[PDB]
Design a protein around this nucleic acid. Sequence first.
DNA 1: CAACTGATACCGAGAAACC
DNA 2: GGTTTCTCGGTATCAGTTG
Lengths: 109, 108
Amino acid sequence: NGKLRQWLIDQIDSGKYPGLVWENEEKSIFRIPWKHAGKQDYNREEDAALFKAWALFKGKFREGIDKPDPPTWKTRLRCALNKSNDFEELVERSQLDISDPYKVYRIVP
Amino acid sequence: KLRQWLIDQIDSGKYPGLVWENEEKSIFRIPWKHAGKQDYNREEDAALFKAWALFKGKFREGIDKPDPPTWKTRLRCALNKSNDFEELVERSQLDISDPYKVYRIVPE
DNA sequence: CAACTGATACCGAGAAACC
DNA sequence: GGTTTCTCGGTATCAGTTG
C-alpha cells in the first residue's frame, strides 16, 4: 500500500529535478532542494517541480481543473517526509541558511 | 446495528446539532468539527462519540483513558461503512461555522 | 500578509474481529 | 455471511513562527 518510497527513489533516479541528487553510491542518503517561495533566488518552475509532481502523482492536484497552490504541495511533501518511517532527515547536514538551502534525508530498509 | 442507536440519539434531542432535516425522520444532520489539541469541546457533539464508546464498551468511564480522536474515527468508519446510512454529500457543510454533514437512513 | 512549520487530528480502504 | 473495529500510509489542520 506504500507509494512514497518507490516514487521518491524513481524521482531522484530520473535526474529530472536539479538538486535532487544522491549523496552516496549506496542509494541511501540524498539531498533535496528547499527554497522559500518569497525570496528572489526562487524559481517557480524548478524549485516547486518536485512538490507539484508528488501532488499530481497521488491525484490531489489535477492540471486544468484545480487552482494551483505550491505552498500546499510543499506542506504535503514535508508532512509525508516527517510522518513516514522510511525517511528521516539528518538535521545537522541540512543547511537551510545558504544561497541554496537544501535538506539531507536518509532511507531505512 | 448502530441504526437504532443513532436514531434514538437524534430523537433524544440531547445532542446539539443532531436534528432531523424533515418530518419523516429519515434525513438528519450531524455536527463535524475539527478538534483543537486537548480542545475537544469546540466539537458541538463530542458527547455523541463518548456515547458510542460507552455503548459498545470501548471506553470504561473511570477505568480507561479518554481518547476522543479514535472515538470519532470509530464513529465515522462505522457510519460510512454501514449500508444503513447514505451520505447526502451534496448537502454536507464542512466549510461553515457550526459545520455538519447530512445523512439519510435507508429502510434496508 | 504570504510562506512555512512541528505536532496532533483526520481519513479511506482494506484486514481482522465479532455476531 | 453480516456489522463494526483495527492498521497503515499518508493527508489536513492547530496553533503558531519566519521573512
